[PDB]
Amino acid sequence: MKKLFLVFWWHMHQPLYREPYTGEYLLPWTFFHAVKDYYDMPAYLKDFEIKLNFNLTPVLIDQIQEYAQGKAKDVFLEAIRKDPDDLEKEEVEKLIEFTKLNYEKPIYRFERIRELMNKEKLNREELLDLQTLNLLAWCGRTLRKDLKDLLNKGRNYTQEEKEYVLNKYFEIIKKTLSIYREIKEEGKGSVSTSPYYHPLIPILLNPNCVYETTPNVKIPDFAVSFREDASKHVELAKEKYFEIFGEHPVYMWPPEASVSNEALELYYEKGINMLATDEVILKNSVERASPYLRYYFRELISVFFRDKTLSDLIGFSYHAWNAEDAVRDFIGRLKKIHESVDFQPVVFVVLNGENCWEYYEENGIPFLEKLYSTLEKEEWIETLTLEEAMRKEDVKTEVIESVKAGTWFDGNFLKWIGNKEKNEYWKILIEAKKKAKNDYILVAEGSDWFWWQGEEKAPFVEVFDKLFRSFVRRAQE
Numbered sequence: 001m002k003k004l005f006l007v008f009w010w011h012m013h014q015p016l017y018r019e020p021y022t023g024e025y026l027l028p029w030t031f032f033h034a035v036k037d038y039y040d041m042p043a044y045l046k047d048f049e050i051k052l053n054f055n056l057t058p059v060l061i062d063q064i065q066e067y068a069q070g071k072a073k074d075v076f077l078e079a080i081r082k083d084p085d086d087l088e089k090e091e092v093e094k095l096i097e098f099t100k101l102n103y104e105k106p107i108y109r110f111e112r113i114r115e116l117m118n119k120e121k122l123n124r125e126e127l128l129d130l131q132t133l134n135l136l137a138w139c140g141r142t143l144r145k146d147l148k149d150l151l152n153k154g155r156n157y158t159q160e161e162k163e164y165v166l167n168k169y170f171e172i173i174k175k176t177l178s179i180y181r182e183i184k185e186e187g188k189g190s191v192s193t194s195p196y197y198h199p200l201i202p203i204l205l206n207p208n209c210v211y212e213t214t215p216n217v218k219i220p221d222f223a224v225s226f227r228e229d230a231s232k233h234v235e236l237a238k239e240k241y242f243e244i245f246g247e248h249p250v251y252m253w254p255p256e257a258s259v260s261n262e263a264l265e266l267y268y269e270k271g272i273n274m275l276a277t278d279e280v281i282l283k284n285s286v287e288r289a290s291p292y293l294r295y296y297f298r299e300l301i302s303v304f305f306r307d308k309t310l311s312d313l314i315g316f317s318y319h320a321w322n323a324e325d326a327v328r329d330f331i332g333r334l335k336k337i338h339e340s341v342d343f344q345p346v347v348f349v350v351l352n353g354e355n356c357w358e359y360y361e362e363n364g365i366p367f368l369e370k371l372y373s374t375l376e377k378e379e380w381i382e383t384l385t386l387e388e389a390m391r392k393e394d395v396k397t398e399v400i401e402s403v404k405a406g407t408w409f410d411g412n413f414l415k416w417i418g419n420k421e422k423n424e425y426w427k428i429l430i431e432a433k434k435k436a437k438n439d440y441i442l443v444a445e446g447s448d449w450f451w452w453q454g455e456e457k458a459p460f461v462e463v464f465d466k467l468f469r470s471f472v473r474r475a476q477e
């Protein structure tokens with residue numbers, strides 16, 4: 001019977017928050033997304049008889065390992081752990097600002113949070129609740145079962161109960177890499193990786209590729225070559241992945257879905273057999289093309305183009321829908337795809353796996369449980385591992401010879417280069433590369449630093465600048 005082949009590929013990444021001179025983690029986001037998403041997203045595979053795939057960047061793996069070993073010195077978590085009597089004013093301020101930053105998210109819907117944010121001054125017990133409810137807001141699906149007492153309590157937390165939550169949270173972190181190994185060993189999902197620090201490979205290989213989609217921009221003089229670094233990002237990622245999973249990775253997620261003819265050749269030369277990228281790149285590159293085929297770039301490497309609509313539905317729209325209606329809508333779209341082709345379509349749903357859930361009611365758990373429970377029971381839908389997608393015989397395929405370089409942001413590079421502020425970071429990087437002495441220059445090549453550059457309304461955005469500049473400084477020493 002004619003199946004629809006469905007492929008989820010959840011991308012997990014954090015830039016390095018660990019400042020190199022102090023060793024301090026200047027932002028807590030790796031901790032909070034580890035305890036909330038990085039274990040719990042693959043742990044859905046314990047309860048639902050489907051396949052789900054994951055990408056982990058090596059720089060994220062490094063940080064998970066440091067927290068699991070108890071070695072991460074996290075400045076914001078220190079303000080959470082302390083007895084409020086020991087908090088400095090600056091730490092209380094950071095606590096309030098962090099809460100206000102997250103205040104409108106449904107995972108922060110505690111009545112006690114509302115009371116605390118309307119009080120003009122907080123005493124010790126009120127600050128204990130503020131600290132503990134910030135922790136509990138980030139609680140993942142697994143511990144929502146075991147901490148139900150504390151969660152329904154909702155207020156009047158003790159220092160000892162807060163330390164108990166912290167202990168359970170670190171237990172989740174300690175099990176996180178093991179669950180990825182486990183679902184891989186069990187055949188329930190493939191795990192991929194990306195070039196080590198999530199750089200923009202097409203720019204490192206050939207900055208002129210930005211002109212293919214945006215010819216009216218100016219970019220700085222790349223007076224030194226980054227081509228060898230692009231190679232090192234891929235090679236070091238392969239080595240880290242082997243250490244964790246015991247194989248060389250044959251699938252990679254290109255950061256920001258970013259490809260070019262040169263980048264595809266590099267992935268081929270490094271032994272990658274398959275990657276995915278964005279539908280906008282497909283439409284920019286091939287006339288009349290469908291994203292439901294397996295493509296062979298120059299007969300060198302396999303490429304899938306994600307279904308942008310389905311991926312954007314989960315990432316941008318469904319957070320505001322009733323979970324039941326969202327799942328029924330999603331199935332109805334898969335039905336239309338299935339009825340619309342006479343071959344068996346391959347549908348790639350690819351997006352970040354940790355950022356959208358905080359905007360869903362109950363951290364996305366009603367939505368994903370309903371979605372996965374429905375998918376495991378649809379006999380005309382077969383969810384696939386990446387390995388199954390690449391080896392399946394009864395799929396339609398097409399050879400293509402050229403792509404227009406781009407990313408999944410509008411098919412171009414303008415969110416990372418081309419304006420005055422963003423170009424300033426590239427100029428800093430270029431001049432530092434000329435004098436670089438160690439691999440901290442590779443850290444500074446990560447895309448996150450250039451993404452935030454120019455952003456002036458984001459609280460904590462100065463922290464990303466402090467990190468970038470520290471890595472650039474350390475690279476030259």
Ligand SMILES: OC[C@H]1O[C@@H]2O[C@H]3[C@H](O)[C@@H](O)[C@@H](O[C@H]4[C@H](O)[C@@H](O)[C@@H](O[C@H]5[C@H](O)[C@@H](O)[C@@H](O[C@H]6[C@H](O)[C@@H](O)[C@@H](O[C@H]7[C@H](O)[C@@H](O)[C@@H](O[C@H]8[C@H](O)[C@@H](O)[C@@H](O[C@H]1[C@H](O)[C@H]2O)O[C@@H]8CO)O[C@@H]7CO)O[C@@H]6CO)O[C@@H]5CO)O[C@@H]4CO)O[C@@H]3CO
Pocket residue numbers: 011012013014015029033101256315351352354355408409447448451457458459460
């Ligand atoms: O650098 C820190 C960051 O690193 C990782 O994120 C990278 C990710 O791994 C890459 O794949 C890529 O992500 C792209 C993404 O997949 C696309 O969807 C899109 O992003 C859009 C968002 O999906 C969309 O929601 C919206 O974002 C806006 C928010 O809606 C708005 O509320 C606000 O967001 C603020 C947050 O509420 C606040 O918490 C804080 O954000 C912090 C994160 O919470 C924290 O985890 C961390 O983020 C990590 C991330 O988890 C990694 O996966 O630090 C953040 C900063 O402190 O502050 C936010 C800003 O005030 O504003 C945002 C807009 O910024 O729109 C976006 C844009 O369309 O595009 C992505 C890029 O192609 O890149 C990211 C970043 O490098």
